[PDB]
Structure 1
Amino acid sequence: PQPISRLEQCGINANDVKKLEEAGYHTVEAVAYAPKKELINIKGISEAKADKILTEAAKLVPMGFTTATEFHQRRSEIIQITTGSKELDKLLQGGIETGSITEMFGEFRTGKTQICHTLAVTCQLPIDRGGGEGKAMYIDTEGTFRPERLLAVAERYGLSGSDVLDNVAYARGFNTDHQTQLLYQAEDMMVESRYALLIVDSATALYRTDYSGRGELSARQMHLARFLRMLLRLADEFGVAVVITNQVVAQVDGAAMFAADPKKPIGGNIIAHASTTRLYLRKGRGETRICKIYDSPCLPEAEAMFAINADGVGD
């Protein structure tokens, strides 16, 4: 979370720092995580200044061989924010892991925003209470925030509804460029504080609605790859749990029977590879719904029944 200004005092001229700040770079770790040509292609001064600023940034940040001994040791501090249901939390090995993209998707009324609200609430719980003790974020691309649901959720854990609402940041995503710019703002908006959770509800709704077509608007895949890359950059530099959610699309080929039903996630492989944890939700009966692990390099696929009660997710 070290800012750009920390680079300035270590033998860096103010022009480069101010250009970096204006361009949307707020963390020296992010610069050390940035491609050389990307930093070069800003104004023109950084073109000849890259060979010095990159070394100045890397002299502090350890980017050599973070051996698996150190990686496992730093894996201990991973919060694994709770889910809301004991079944979901246990099936997720203690809950939703932090520092990674943990996209979930499903058909309508699968509880995507319900789990989003429960996460935005329970990430503020103390560490022993199933949370990161952090301040939540929420980037909704449709407006279904429903903060009254947050208040109702806040009652179950005994946390006061007075501060769980002021401990949540909100932002309306209106297009793809708005998504990227809001993420840029969130970069310097969580830099000073401990934020344990980042929400983007329907990270792909605007991609699907705006970049519509084949070929005519299939630069969307490069755009979405860039966006998911920036989410992973944030989740690495800050340790924040990115919990973007995704919609689904139908299989219309001659067959009717398919793996995981005709309903398969949208985005293609740009979003499938750049998504470490992937949960597929379906509809059961009444409140009950079933969760299945679609893609995760650490979990076995199974079923966990979570019911959308009067206070979020639980049983």
Structure 2
Amino acid sequence: GPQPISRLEQCGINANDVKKLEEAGFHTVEAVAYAPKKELINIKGISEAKADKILAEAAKLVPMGFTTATEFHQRRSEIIQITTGSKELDKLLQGGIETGSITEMFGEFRTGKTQICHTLAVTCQLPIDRGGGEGKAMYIDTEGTFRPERLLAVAERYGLSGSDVLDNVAYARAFNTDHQTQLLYQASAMMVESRYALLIVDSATALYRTDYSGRGELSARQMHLARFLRMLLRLADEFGVAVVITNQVVAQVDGAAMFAADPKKPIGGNIIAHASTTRLYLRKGRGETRICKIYDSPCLPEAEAMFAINADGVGDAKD
């Protein structure tokens, strides 16, 4: 897909500048082309004229002009969608999880976000004809709730070899927001090295509840979250992978005497509200059955579906 940054020096760029760009975090030509001039200026060994030449070469290599809507419609129709393991969820989402956009899931506890993440981590390795993506999976964990036993159970459900499935999942643990952001460069290196098709960040906003406590730290927290979301978006655009993140909820103490009898809204605010493309609202039903609802989408109507959590993972509500 993306063209490696090692093709710039053929256009008249010295190797040291390419190496400096590589430490900067840009590993492809597309990454350099999308970056603004200010980002290139902050490099120690790059001046304004060097940035101008690099941007000119990148724009020469990468098309960034106007296009007819017919071409965009034709190109969009071949994107891949990953099955969620449930027929009702697939029907609700009209195919499954899209690639190239940020999808977010939120809800209270025991609502099944981690189980859905595990199921997506396994099912993304299936052949495209079976609803998969034919790639690898990347799991970034910030809570410590990653269990390969669920992956083994799902693989046994789908008739795959357990050892191979475990070998195709990359796992990293984040201990703070600064470390969480630092993990998105090695991710770029691994993605340019090998073909990946998924990226789970669970939970995306777990550490922000504690790293910034009061109202006096709201602005810095929101700016950091916005930068993190922008990095996720640039990764999704550059490599064409599906980005799935999870969120948490906060109570509505003022209440206003509404019928819900227990109101709650996701955390993150307008930043993550405007940045996410698709959002799913999960809640508990009866026994092991849960309910999923479309909360925001550019092309999907507001509707609900019912799934369940079984011993084999996320699946349809067993009778």
Same fold (TM over 0.5): yes
CA offsets per residue over residues 34-69 of structure 1, 9 Å max, x none?
A: 111111112152433111100111101111113322
CA offsets per residue over residues 205-240 of structure 1, 9 Å max, x none?
A: 111221221133431111111111111111111110
- Residue 116 of structure 1 deviates from its aligned partner by 0.3
Confirm or deny: 8 A CA contact 1:82 1:94 kept in the other structure.
Answer: yes
CA offsets per residue over residues 181-226 of structure 1, 9 Å max, x none?
A: 1111101111122211111011111112212211334311111111
Of stretches 173-182 and 82-91 in structure 1, the one that deviates more from structure 2 is 173-182
- Aligned runs of 1:1-315 on 2, under 5 Å? 1-257=2-258, 262-314=263-315
* TM-score of the superposed pair, with normalisation by structure 2: 0.95
- Mapped partners of 1:292, 1:69: distance in 2: 32
Of stretches 241-250 and 212-221 in structure 1, the one that deviates more from structure 2 is 212-221
CA spacing shift, 1:250–1:81, aligned 2, 3 Å: same
CA offsets per residue over residues 124-166 of structure 1, 9 Å max, x none?
A: 0000111110001100111111011100010111111120100
* TM-score of the superposed pair, with normalisation by structure 1: 0.96
- Residue 263 of structure 1 deviates from its aligned partner by 1.1
- Mapped partners of 1:98, 1:209: distance in 2: 31
Confirm or deny: 8 A CA contact 2:20 2:45 kept in the other structure.
Answer: no
In the TM superposition, structure 1's runs of 4+ consecutive aligned residues that sit over 4 Å from their partners are: 258-261
Unaligned runs of 5+ in 1: none
* 3-state SS in 1 of match to 2:8: helix
- Mapped partners of 1:73, 1:159: distance in 2: 34
* 3-state SS in 2 of match to 1:190: helix
Of stretches 107-116 and 205-214 in structure 1, the one that deviates more from structure 2 is 205-214
* 3-state SS in 2 of match to 1:89: helix
- Residue 24 of structure 1 deviates from its aligned partner by 1.4
* 3-state SS in 2 of match to 1:179: helix
- Mapped partners of 1:52, 1:89: distance in 2: 47
- Residue 261 of structure 1 deviates from its aligned partner by 5.4
- Residue 254 of structure 1 deviates from its aligned partner by 4.4
- Mapped partners of 1:253, 1:38: distance in 2: 43
Of stretches 247-256 and 290-299 in structure 1, the one that deviates more from structure 2 is 247-256
Question: Cα RMSD over matched residues?
Answer: 1.5
Confirm or deny: 8 A CA contact 2:25 2:185 kept in the other structure.
Answer: yes
- Residue 14 of structure 1 deviates from its aligned partner by 1.2
- Residue 8 of structure 1 deviates from its aligned partner by 2.2
Confirm or deny: 8 A CA contact 1:16 1:46 kept in the other structure.
Answer: no
Confirm or deny: 8 A CA contact 1:256 1:262 kept in the other structure.
Answer: no
CA spacing shift, 1:100–1:258, aligned 2, 3 Å: farther
CA spacing shift, 1:15–1:224, aligned 2, 3 Å: same
- Mapped partners of 2:279, 2:34: distance in 1: 25
* 3-state SS in 2 of match to 1:162: helix
* 3-state SS in 2 of match to 1:9: helix
- Residue 11 of structure 1 deviates from its aligned partner by 1.4
CA spacing shift, 1:73–1:199, aligned 2, 3 Å: same
Of stretches 91-100 and 187-196 in structure 1, the one that deviates more from structure 2 is 187-196
Unaligned runs of 5+ in 2: none
CA spacing shift, 1:257–1:71, aligned 2, 3 Å: same
Confirm or deny: 8 A CA contact 1:41 1:47 kept in the other structure.
Answer: no
CA spacing shift, 1:112–1:254, aligned 2, 3 Å: closer
CA offsets per residue over residues 54-107 of structure 1, 9 Å max, x none?
A: 011110111111332222222122111111111111101100111110011111
CA spacing shift, 1:96–1:258, aligned 2, 3 Å: farther
Confirm or deny: 8 A CA contact 2:102 2:242 kept in the other structure.
Answer: yes
* Number of equivalenced pairs: 315
* 3-state SS in 2 of match to 1:155: helix
- Mapped partners of 2:306, 2:264: distance in 1: 19
* 3-state SS in 2 of match to 1:313: strand
